[PDB]
């Protein structure tokens, strides 16, 4: 998975001058059967996936995947 929603999210806010973006780390599940659900929250808004990723850093990056396409 790539990473380059972060570095998307961050250019944005910066360049239309918003309020630094805030995510969420929670990390609930089994050894063998962890789920990473994270939240970004944006302009008031907090955007959340249905789908659990297997590791941390790719639920902020799917988080900000589905934040950024509702800015546009």
Do not use: W
């Not at 929670?26 to 297997?54: D, I, K, Y």
């Amino acid at each position: 998975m790539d990473h380059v929603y972060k570095g998307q999210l961050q250019a944005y806010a910066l360049q239309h001058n918003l309020e630094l973006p805030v995510y969420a780390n929670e990390r609930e599940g089994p050894p063998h059967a962890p789920r990473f659900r994270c939240n970004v929250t944006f302009c008031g808004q907090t955007f959340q996936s249905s789908e659990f990723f297997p590791t941390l850093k790719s639920a902020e990056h799917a988080a900000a995947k589905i934040a950024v396409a509702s800015l546009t």
